[PDB]
Every structure is written in C-alpha cells, then in structure tokens.
Design an enzyme around this catalytic site. Structure first.
Site, mmCIF file in Angstrom:
data_model
loop_
_atom_site.group_PDB
_atom_site.id
_atom_site.type_symbol
_atom_site.label_atom_id
_atom_site.label_comp_id
_atom_site.label_asym_id
_atom_site.label_seq_id
_atom_site.Cartn_x
_atom_site.Cartn_y
_atom_site.Cartn_z
ATOM 1 N N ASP A 462 0.830 -1.202 0.000
ATOM 2 C CA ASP A 462 0.000 0.000 0.000
ATOM 3 C C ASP A 462 0.865 1.252 0.000
ATOM 4 O OD1 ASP A 462 -0.807 -2.194 1.984
ATOM 5 O OD2 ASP A 462 -2.779 -1.414 1.404
ATOM 6 N N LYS A 556 -2.662 13.265 13.092
ATOM 7 C CA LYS A 556 -2.855 12.208 12.103
ATOM 8 C C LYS A 556 -4.043 12.492 11.192
ATOM 9 C CE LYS A 556 -3.339 7.252 11.443
ATOM 10 N NZ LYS A 556 -2.970 5.911 11.978
ATOM 11 N N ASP A 725 -5.188 1.611 -4.123
ATOM 12 C CA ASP A 725 -3.763 1.908 -4.079
ATOM 13 C C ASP A 725 -2.992 0.746 -3.483
ATOM 14 O OD1 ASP A 725 -4.518 4.340 -1.473
ATOM 15 O OD2 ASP A 725 -4.308 2.162 -1.315
#
Lengths: 796, 840
Positions: A462, A556, A725
């Site tokens: 990923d 985050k 992805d």
DNA sequence: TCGAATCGCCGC
RNA sequence: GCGGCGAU
DNA sequence: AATCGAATCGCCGC
RNA sequence: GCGGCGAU
DNA sequence: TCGATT
C-alpha cells in the site's frame, strides 16, 4: 399493497435464454455454465425478496410514502392539491405533503375522523416546530442534533427541549384539528385502487432492478463495451463499465477509445480466487461465541459517554449483519475450486468489484479470500511473505530487516497460531487479525514443506499517502515526496510525525515569545449579562499543548483529511473530537481550560506545518479549486443580466486515457419538514469541494490500471488483489509487482504533465474576464522521479 | 517498613515435624504424606506472599495505617495525642496575647479527628521528603478537607441520602469531586447557611500541621525531630523520622500476620478426621489451625470443647471423606473459551435516568473485573489439580452450624467451579441412575418448574442437541445458553457416555437436589402448616409449586378487585399533592402485568426478616425503576406510591400463604428482644436482669450461641477511613434467620450420616440445602433426605425446646409480654416421604 | 427517634 | 468499615 | 455588508 | 435526505 | 476566518 412476483417470468428468462448458455458452456463446461446462470438468477431472486421485506415494514410503519414506489404518484398529485388549497382559500405545499403522507400511512395500517385528527395534530406540531426553524440561526444549532435524532417521537422530544430553552432565553382545539383534517380531506377529495396499482406495479419493477450481486463461478464476461460486461446473462440490470448518476454521462464513454483501460479491467476480472478454508474454519467457530470475533479478547463526562454507548450498541448490531452475510457467502463458495469477481469503475476511474462479497472488504472478509493459482514460494517469496505478515501485525513503520526480525523472533507464536488457532489468541490481537492468521498458515507451510511449497496468498503493498504521493510527483516536490517515502530512504518516514515535530517547533516558539492573555467583556444576547472573558494568548495556549505532549496522534487525521479538502477550519473540529474531548473524559485536559481556544490554536499550527511539509499538495489543490470555481461560475453582464458564459463542467483525461466529467447538479427547489421526511443547475460549491479529491483519485486509478497491464505484460503476473492503491499478488510474483508499480508511476509523470494537460482542456472555456483571475501553474520542484524506483517504503 | 521472612525457618517446620508426618504416613503412606505436607507448606507460602504484595501497595499509597499491623500501635498513641490537643487548647486560651495561628484552624475539626489525620498522614508521608514542611502541609490540607466537607455531614439529614453515593465512589479525588458538587448544590438551596468555604492559604496549612507534629512528639513521640545545617540561612532544614521501636512493632506484626493467613488448597489425601475443636482438616500442625466452628471470639469456640456431639462430628468427617476429581472434559472447554471472552457464557450471539445509567456502567465495569479475577483463580486451581486421581476438601461450620468447605477452590462455588468438579468414585449408572441423570440435566437447563415426566421428555426431545454439544462443545453453543451452562455441559458428557457405553457405564457425576425454599420448608414443618407446606412442595402436589407465582396470583386477585372497588385519588397537603388511590394504583400495575418476577425477591428475603417496608425498596429497584429506564413505567406516574402499594399487596399475599413462617419468626424475634433487654426498676434505676444472649441446640446436637456485641465508640472521616455490650437490635434481627439456618444445617448433617449408614452412600455434594451424590446412589439420597426431615420434626418440637432453654432467664416483668408458642397445623409429616418436588 | 441472614473471595 | 463478586 | 461553508464507493437502518 | 457501518 | 457567494 399487492405485489406481483417478478420471478416466474422475468427471472426465468435469464436462465432460459439459449444464447448465453451455448456460449458459456463451450468455454467452461455445461455444468459450470448452468451454475453461473442459476447463481445470477438467484441474485435477482434475492433482491426481489429484499425489497418485499422492506416494503412490508414500511406498510406497518406507514412509511410507504417514503418508499420509492409511492413517490411518483405523489409528485403528480401534490401540485394539483396545493392550487386547490389556494383556490379554496402553514405553507400551502407542506400541508399538501402532510395530507398525502398521512392519508397513505393511515390506509396502510380507516375512519375518516381518525385520519383528520392525525393530519391536524401533525399540522399543529409542525407549525410549532416550523416557526423556530423558520430563529433560523438558533435552529441551525438545533438542526444538527435534530438531524441526529431518529424517528418523529425523538424529533418531537428534541423539539420540545429546544423550545423550552428558547422560551427561557427569549427568542420567542381537538375538534378544530379534526376539522382541519376534514377540510384538508375535502380539498384532497377535490384533488382508490387505480392509484394503488401504480405503487404495486412500481414495487415489482424496483424489485427486478436491485439484485444481490454474487461472485462468479466462471471467469467473468470480458468488457468489450460500455454495458453488458461482468455477468454473462442478459439481465434487467446490465452492468455499466462506469457507475454513472446519469444515463447521459454513461453515454459519453460509448464513443471514447480506451484500449488500456479495458485491458486493465478484463485482467483484474480474470483473477481467480478461492475461499481460505483454514481461516473460514476458525471464523465459523469464534463467530458463534462472539459478536465480533476479535473485538474483546481478555488480556459532564457521563453525558458524552451516554451518547456513545447508544451509538456503540447500534454500531455493534451494524457490524454483525455485515459479518453474517460475508460468512455465509464464504461458506457457500468454500468448496468451489475457483471463484471470480467482475469489476467496473466509478465515475472518477477507481476500480471496484461488483459483488457484495469482494476482496475489497474488511479484514475478516479479506482474510476469508485467497488467490487460486499459486507458484512455489522460493527464497524471495518467503521474504515477501514474511514482510506481509509483519505488516498485518502493525509492524510497518520500521525498515524491512526489522520487519523480518520481528517475524523470526515470534516464530514459535506464529507456529502455535497455525497449529491451534482456537488455543492461541495472539493472532486475534494483531492489527489485521484474520489476514495475519492467513499469513500464519502459509508461514507454517513453508517451514513444513520448504521453499518449494506452493503459496497463493495475496501479498498487498500500500502507498503511504497516495494523494500526497501523486501530488508530489506531479510537481516534483522533494520535501513532500520524502515525507511520503517517494525518495529512497534509510528509514520509513512518518508524515504525521513530521507535522507533529514542526508543530512542536511552533509550540516552543510561542511559549517563549507569545501574545499575552487579554480580557474582553462579553454580553450574552439573550441575557444581556456582561461577563469578563479571557482570550488566551499564544504563549498560554502553547503551554497547555506542550503539557499534553504533541504526538503523531494529534496530527494524524488532519493529514489524512487533506486529500479530501479539509483545511484549517475542519482541523479544529478534528482536534476537539480526537484529542481534547477524549482527554477531558479521561480526566486529562486539566491544561485545556478552554477547549475551543486550544483546538483553534492547534488547527492553525497543524495547517502551517502541513503547508510547509507538502507544498505541492497544498498548491495543486488550490490551483484545481480555482479552476473549478471559474468554470462553474455563470458570467453575466451586470447591466444586461444576460449570461455571457454559462456554468461549465470540468473534464480531463487520465494518462491511461480514461475521461471523467464532474457535473455536480443542484435542484432548483426542495421541501423539507421537521417532523416528516423531506420530499438541474450545476453546484459550483460541490465542483470546488470535489475537484481536488476527484482529480487525484482519477490519477491513482490510472496508476492502478497502468500497473496491472504493465505487471501482466512485462511480467507473468496473472493474479491481482487491487484496492485503489493496494496491489497484491502471489509471493512468487510479489517482487515483480513491487517493480511494476514503481515503473508505472515513474513512466507517467515523466511522460505527462497532468496539470498542464488539465489546463489545456479548460483554458478555452474561460471567459475573457476570467483569464487574469486564473492562477498560474505551481512551479516544479527538485525531485527526480527515477529515485522512486529505488525507494523501499513507497510501496507504490 | 522491612519484614523478615517467616518462610525460612517457621514454614520449614511444617514439613519437618515428625508427629504430623507419622500420623499422615500411617494412614496413607510416606509419599502422599510428603505431597500433602509440601502442599500445605505452599498454601502458607502463597498466603505470606499475598500479605507482602498488599503491604507494598499500601505503603506506596500511604495506606499503611489501614493495614492491620499498624492498627494496634495507633490505638495506643491516639488517646495521648487527643489529651495533648485538648490541653493545648486550654493552655493557649489561658495565655494572653495573640492566639497562635493554628488555634482557630484546629478547633473546627474534632480533637479525635485531628489526632488520626496527623498519625495517618505522617505515617503515609514517612513510609512512601521527610521535611516537616511537606508533612505539615499534607496534614493541613487533610484537616481542611475534613473541615470544609465535614460541615455537610454534621446537614445530617440531607447527608444520609448523599452518604451512599459518596461510598459508591472509589478514591479520594472521586470522593472529593463528588463532595464539591453536592456542596455547590446545597449552597444553592441555602442549606449550608449560604457560607461558601474560603480556602485556607498555603502558609496557614503549613502552620496547622507543625502544631500537630509538635503535639505528637510531646504526647506520643513516634516521630522525632532533627535539624540539618543549623544556623545556615540557605540550608537550615528540619526533618522527621519514625521511632525505630514503633517501626519494629508494625514490622513484627506484619510478619506475624503474614504467617497466619494461608491460601487454603485442596488435599491430595483424605482430610484429617475431626476429633475435637481444632486441628481437623489439614494434617500439619500449622500457624493458623482450622476450627470446627468459625467464631468471632475465642470464647465462643471454647464453649464447643466440652459438648458431646457425636453425630455432628460424624457428618463433617463423612463429608470430608468424599473424593472429588477435576472434570477434565469441562476443563478442556473452559480453558479455550475463557481466553476468548471475559465471561465465556456472557454474550453469546443469538437470533436523572442518564445519571442512573452512568452509575450502572460504573458498577458494570467493577463487576466485570471482580468476576474475572475469581474466574482466573478457579481455572488455575482446577488446572493444577487436574492430573490428580482424587482430591479432597476439608469441612468446618459457621457459628450457626452450616457446613462449608475450607479451601478457596471448593464445590460450593459458582457454576464454573461446580462444573469443573466431579466425584471420583463412581458406580455403574443403571436404569434409575440414567433417570436421575436426565432429571439433573433438565434442572441444569432450567426445566425445573415442571413434573419429572416432562423433565425426561425435555431431555429426550433435545437428544440430538445434547449429543452435538458433547461431541463438539466449541462448535455448538446450546449448552452455554442454558441456565447452568458448565454444569449442563457436564451432564451432556455423561449423557453421551451412557449412550455410547450403555447402562453399564460408570458415572461419577454429582446429581444435586435442592430444597425449593429451605427456610419456609423448615418453618412449615415445625408448625405443621398445610398451605405453606404445599406452596414450598413439602406436601405432594399435582405440579411443582412456585411460591412466587402463588404470591403473584394472590397479588393479581387484589389488583383486579382494587380495580373495580377501592379508594379514589385524593389531594393531600405535604410539607398540596395528589395521593393516588388503590383503584388508580391497581390500574397501573395491571397495565404492567404482575408476574412471578414482581414477587420473587420479596419471598426470598422473608427468611432474612424482610417485611412490608423492605419490599417497597425491593419493588422500586427490581421492577419500577428498570421499567422507567426502559420506557415502560409511564403507568408509574408516582413510582413510590406504586411500590408502597405493591409492597402492601405482597406482604398480605405472603402472610396468608405461609402463615407458619410469619408466626414463627415473630415468636423468635419476641424471645430475643426480651432476652436482649436490660431489666431496670425505673425508680431505683438498678438493673434487675442483665442483657442476656440467646442459645439453643439443634436436634443433631449442635449448640449455638447468638451474642451480637456492639463496640462502645467509633470514628468516621469523610475522605480517610474510620478507625462490649449486647446489640439488642442485631439479636432481634438475627434470631429468626439464624435459628432456621441452624435447622437446615442439622438436616444436612443428619442426612449425610443417615445416607451413609442406612444406605451405602460415600460421596456427598453439599451446598447448605443442596444434596448431591453419584447417580447410582441418587434414588437413596432422595429417600434419605426426606426420611431425616420427617424424623426430627416427629421426634423434636424445636420451638418448645427453645422455649425451655430461655424460660428460666426471663425476668418477672417480661413474662406477660412473651407470646405463646404458635399453634400447630393440620399437616402430616409422612406426606413428605411421598413428595416428589420437595427435593429435601 | 430510629430501623427496616450467614459464609467466603477481591479491592480500598 | 466501605466498594464489588460469588454461594445458600 | 450579509452571509454561507468548512472525497469516492459500498452495505444496513429510517 | 438523514442516521450507522465498512473500503481507500 | 477567510475565503467564498449573495
């Protein structure tokens, strides 16, 4: 209220048609054909049942009017009644909507007086609510909680509280109600089985177009065109290569030539999966004992928690219903030697599997599925097999040798979990537990059977932050590219940490030199009460944040939401809900004396830090947003009022060749009721809100599609696990996919200036006044894309 | 501070001493003697380690004063401190000039309270910065906290409703947080006189403690004062140390206490037969020897030394001799599921109120942790003794004579423990054994309110489910869904064995039979109550009789009559509010639907002495309050009026259903009240007859003495914990529940000896009214438990004997007050022999 | 004015 | 003693 | 000035 | 449309 | 809050 059964004729023909059968039978066998057609018939069959169950609960509820089958007659019935009410003479349209819904609901579950009493009682309740909403700014604070309420009873109960507070602050007959409904009925009579047949016929039609899609037992039908791909049988719902809100936007793909796009979709459909029987065997047992198998393994704060536990219980029921479906599907196809998944695309070009049970699911669903064609694992496959297991365990922020070391140090635990999965719970505690358990089974097999042991497990790589990765590649952003591991690096780079470190540098600066705290008098608008209030200076604010300690967990979400268009304002809500509020309920946050002041201070600090970490990302999305605003605007001469340039859609073409049209359209007039359910111009705002995420998602999809064709053509890779992805294949093929995904991305952005190509598509669409307004292209940076090929931790 | 290890010499004696070894070796060989004495040694070792960890935590928290090794010294020093406080106050007053800065602060706190606050906070500070300033500060802030919030406690009437919620919170900060909230609330109401506390400033609090520290050195002298670098303005500091002798005293007492607190474990050899008051059960001469009777004073133990009770001694030794083994099949299942769920059978997937909700989740979080720690101990003990061919449990008695096992892991525990334990010596099951094996399995599933023929029907209908559960307990969760899951699963395994191996199969599973309501059963037997006896299945009945359903029926009959008749609502002024009439109140309850659930707890608490008042608190918490939280209870517009109404209806229903119970407990209560009074001639004032205890003797020959004793004085602080005459109220509260419990203990003891002597029964599962044995002996135990009960109540008039005990002690003024013995009823005891559902 | 079963384990 | 767990 | 606002796809529920 | 869940 | 429409 009487529904014909679609099954006997419409669903029979799907299996019945000879042309699909003869074609399917020759390539895959008669029995495999029949099963695929029987399965496809079953999928339509299940969908008819799902609508029937939903309708039944709606009759008992009287929410038939909310159902789509009762919508079309209301739209033709409503305007004639509104005019009649005016001709006979609350808003006139709302009363017309209330009467139709109450009449249909009362009949569904028959005295004329009873319906009249209900219409008037609801009419009085709505107007008492409507005045507060129709004031409106105060209602906006109420409206979000009103939207959060469920059912009229809770809406009225919430309405009741806001009215009492509103009376306190000062923003402010039974026969007549029955009489109001009677006159409403009298106007309605001026405005029956034949109308009932219309909802009944529509209910059948909506039951035939909503199948419960299921995996293919044969390789899916290849896409040669816009429709008809995937499933083999001619159906009531034919699959579209692009999921479109409009039939017009589907048709713009009919003419277009995209040879590489079609190959990528067909290749992905060809990948043959099988049910991981060992993982399924474990899952079938722990599921009977636990609502979620891995959820709980033994090893003014009250009011906030009360809202969560109601949500948490409702969440726990919502997770289980998904689980029980996936598990049944996994059990159902467990014996099949191979199963396949058809694939279509969203309007931006991301690749999605069509069936409800797909490799793009949750961890249990992901762990339940594995590829069917393996190759002997060998030295390199073992290496990547171990790397995947460390990733499943959450060891993904260290260099690769430390990832292998973690596996080898935990080898006995891995072996124990493979031998007796119900006796050692260590796998369930890992971050991606069922996928980890699947890795454990293969790891044992290599130890038992050696490097010659056949492995078909999907090893997924990923990209760390695809959008920032792509944006940094377009504009050659070294600093942003390094933060997303695009450049080769000795250590895995954490963009959240870098933002957090930069936040701490600002925090230290403001603590030493900061604005001093200031006091401003504030007078409540309702109370008229003057209270002294303290605006916290940056020095005081930084001190609280330094006391808390600012980690990657503070920054985050703001970085993740950056690709979605979040900025300084949206960050402040995140910081409050993510760190400030949860600390308070834990008893920490004694330093956060004012929460909102701290959140606003933090959100500015995160936004400043993000904008210097990834300049190309911030710059590009501003440039795209400016483009969308210009095209979406309608240009009118001020005196004339005539429009020189109409609102314009935004269109571009990916390097793969996929075109995409972004046409967000808002309706002209809409009606919403507080106590009852609410019932074509381009939206400029949604054009701006969506252009930056949709463009970069279009680029990641082209990268995926380029990777799968490049992997299949340059190398032998025939099995692909694709999640937008994330790229997976068997371990023997794993090292080449790692190469192919790097080679594709380097190739495109060396070949294509996507932003300049975008500019050429809309430059002519700009009005003469608009050209000076459009910002120039952001400057390219110092990054060399060839270094992406050498980077270990890009994973993409 | 530091405690020498007991273990090295004194725990070494347990294995060394020859006479305990030889006595064990002669009975069961040297090697079983080696294992037992090492096991008993480990039990003492584990117990000492338990004390050391608790002491270490208490030292860290400053809670050393809470520990028992520090209680004796504090009791000695406390009067000296208090006397010096009071004298200082008198001496400060006598001297003329400005009063010392601590004088006013020390006055609002009770002189007793300051004394304990200083000792605890100084002991806390020294055992966990020895400077006088920090400890004087620490004392002062504690004094102020007792001063500020004490005002709420003593005001007092309101405090009684906040007292429970203060107790329910754990930890000083939570206790203090809650008290700031109530103080703000009561200040808003103006209760505290509207005087908001003005916080002491820091320099004041320092001076408060220093005067306290000085005052202990003069009076008590545990702490001593030392000055470092005198005459240097920079480093002139004063320090505090504990007197070594006082530190040695807690250390000696800490070690003494650790050697007398073992963690009792099961025996690997049959337990030592009881020949006297002490030294039964475990075989070693130990630092904590077992007592036949668990008493609070050594004296109450000594009364038993003389008494000749051969049948009591036989029953305990027979029960001890019962050989148990760990059910490995159950243990295999439990070992797995426990690792996956906190409670393995809790959540199986299957197809102001907000403030009260928050208190519920807090309690639930406590309950989860406390439940799981017990589970982990039981499994560890179970896995420990899993490989032994047999294990044994010693037994002793409470002061009323009820029989209890001594080891912490014992057959009298929860389901999981009971499921993990099976008998060791089994016999071939047989037809009759299979029959009761299925009846037992039916009861473990919850099919117990039904005749035996349908209990067998339930088992046989679910044969395939029972089989699947035994084959794969982890694949079929049906057993976990049952009322007694692990015990049901244990039945599933034996049921599967009987089908595999036939009726020749050797089954050693304990088949428990439990009296429905043992107290009411016994009371119905004493006074021969037919109606009461039928309700508790003493007399043979067409079906099983549910006393809750009976009371619910009688409640509903009143409700229906009170719905047609009965008082209208009226308005009463209260210091005007509507007082709901019985007609309105009946309608609310009929709308709710009154079931055996509404009446269950009230009947259960009857043997404990609960009456109409106690039912109202039960009704409110059991049904009404949960109904309101659920969105039911719209009918309960006034919840307290409904509860009080229903409590009246339950009490009327109960009293007419079991008359013998109500009458018998009243007579015993009247007896204890008269005996517990002091008789004083009012004019003279002299006490003619002293306060007297209550004593009786069971038909089994067990004597028992009820002497509830009250302490003279006690102390209680809000944020720190608080630290003989006959209690007449506890004598009256306890006499009736204790008397009936002494009877069921005699019935249990008489049953095991009668089952052992008349029939061959050698294995007994005993929980106070539950009688278990292997299936082959189940039919005879069923016979034996009925035969004993008929015999004693034919042979003995327990109430009349009780009267003969205390009649001499009664004073002449009291004799007119004493009620007569309740009249006997028409019940025939021989019907108990043919009663299927008495189970006892 | 007050109040309204026994036994153990864990925690304080 | 207070908090919670379990047994009857 | 006034004022509004602050990713895609899927499933379940209303 | 709203709410909840999951994928990126 | 600063841009955005309005």
């Amino acid at each position: 209220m009487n529904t014909i059964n679609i099954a006997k004729n419409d669903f029979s023909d799907i299996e019945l048609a000879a042309i699909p059968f003869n074609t399917l039978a020759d390539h895959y066998g008669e029995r495999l054909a029949r099963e695929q057609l029987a399965l496809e018939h079953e999928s339509y069959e299940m969908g008819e049942a799902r609508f029937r169950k939903m309708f039944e609960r709606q009759l008992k509820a009287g929410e038939v009017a909310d159902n789509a089958a009762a919508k079309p007659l209301i739209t033709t019935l409503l305007p004639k009644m509104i005019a009649r009410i005016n001709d006979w003479f609350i808003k006139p349209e709302a009363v017309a909507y209330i009467t139709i819904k109450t009449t249909l609901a009362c009949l569904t579950s028959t005295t004329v007086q009873a319906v009249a009493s209900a219409i008037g009682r609801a009419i009085e309740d709505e107007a008492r609510f409507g005045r507060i909403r129709d004031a409106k700014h105060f209602k906006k604070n109420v409206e979000e909680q009103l939207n959060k309420r469920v059912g009229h009873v809770y809406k009225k109960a919430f309405m009741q509280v806001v009215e009492a507070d509103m009376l306190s602050k000062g923003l402010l007959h039974k026969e007549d109600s029955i009489h109001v409904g009677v006159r409403c009925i009298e106007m309605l009579i001026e405005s029956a089985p034949e109308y009932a047949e219309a909802i009944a016929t529509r209910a059948g039609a909506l039951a035939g177009i909503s199948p419960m899609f299921q995996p293919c037992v044969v390789p899916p039908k290849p896409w040669t065109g816009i429709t008809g791909g995937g499933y083999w049988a001619n159906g009531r719902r034919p699959l579209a290569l692009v999921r479109t809100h409009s039939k017009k936007a589907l048709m713009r793909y009919e003419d277009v030539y995209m040879p590489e796009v079609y190959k990528a979709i067909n290749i992905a459909q060809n990948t043959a999966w099988k049910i991981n029987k060992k993982v399924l065997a474990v899952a079938n047992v722990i599921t009977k004992w636990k609502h979620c198998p891995v959820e709980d393994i033994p090893a003014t704060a009250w009011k906030r928690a009360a809202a969560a536990v109601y949500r948490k219980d409702k969440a726990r029921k919502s997770r289980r219903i998904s689980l029980e479906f996936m598990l049944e599907q996994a059990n159902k196809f467990a014996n099949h030697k191979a199963i396949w998944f058809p694939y279509n695309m969203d309007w931006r070009g991301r690749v999605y599997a069509v069936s409800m049970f797909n490799p793009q699911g949750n961890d249990m669903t992901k762990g339940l599925l594995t590829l069917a064609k393996g190759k002997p694992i060998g030295k390199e496959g073992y290496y990547w097999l171990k790397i995947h297991g460390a990733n499943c365990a959450g060891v993904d922020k260290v260099p690769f040798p430390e990832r292998i070391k973690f596996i080898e140090e935990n080898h006995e635990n891995i072996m124990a979990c493979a031998k007796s999965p119900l006796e050692n719970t260590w796998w369930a505690e890992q971050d991606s537990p069922f996928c980890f358990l699947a890795f454990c089974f293969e790891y044992a097999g290599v130890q038992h059977h050696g490097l010659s042991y056949n492995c078909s497990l999907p090893l997924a790589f990923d990209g760390s932050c695809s959008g920032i990765q792509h944006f940094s590649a377009m504009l050659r952003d070294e600093v942003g590219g390094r933060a997303v591991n695009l450049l080769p690096s000795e250590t895995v780079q954490d963009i959240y940490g870098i933002v957090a470190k930069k936040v701490n540098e600002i925090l230290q600066a403001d603590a030493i030199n900061g604005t001093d705290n200031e006091v401003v008098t504030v007078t409540d608008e309702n109370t008229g009460e003057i209270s002294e209030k303290v605006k916290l200076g940056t020095k005081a604010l930084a001190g609280q944040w330094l006391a808390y300690g600012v980690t990657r967990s503070v920054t985050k979400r703001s970085v993740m939401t950056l690709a979605y268009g979040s900025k300084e304002f949206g960050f402040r809500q995140q910081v409050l809900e993510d760190t400030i509020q949860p600390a308070i309920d834990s008893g920490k946050g004694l330093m956060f004396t004012q929460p909102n002041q701290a959140a606003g201070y933090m959100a500015k600090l995160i936004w400043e830090s993000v904008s210097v970490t990834v300049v190309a990302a911030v710059e590009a999305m501003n440039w795209l947003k400016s483009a969308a605003k210009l095209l979406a605007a309608e240009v009118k001469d001020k005196k004339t009022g005539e429009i020189l340039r109409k609102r314009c859609a935004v269109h571009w073409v990916t390097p793969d060749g996929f075109p995409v049209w972004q046409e967000y359209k808002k309706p002209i007039q809409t009606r919403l009721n507080l106590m009852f359910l609410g019932q074509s111009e381009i939206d400029a705002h949604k054009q701006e809100s969506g252009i930056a995420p949709n463009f970069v998602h279009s680029q990641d999809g082209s990268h995926l599609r380029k990777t799968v064709v490049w992997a299949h053509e340059k190398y032998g890779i025939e099995s692909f696990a694709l999640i937008h992805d994330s790229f997976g294949t068997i371990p023997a093929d794993a090292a080449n996919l790692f190469k192919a995904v790097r080679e594709t991305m380097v190739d495109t952005y060396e070949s294509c200036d996507v932003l300049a190509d975008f500019y050429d598509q809309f430059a002519d669409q700009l009005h003469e006044s608009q050209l000076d307004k459009m910002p120039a292209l952001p400057a390219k940076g110092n990054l060399n894309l060839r270094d992406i090929l050498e980077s270990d931790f890009a994973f993409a």
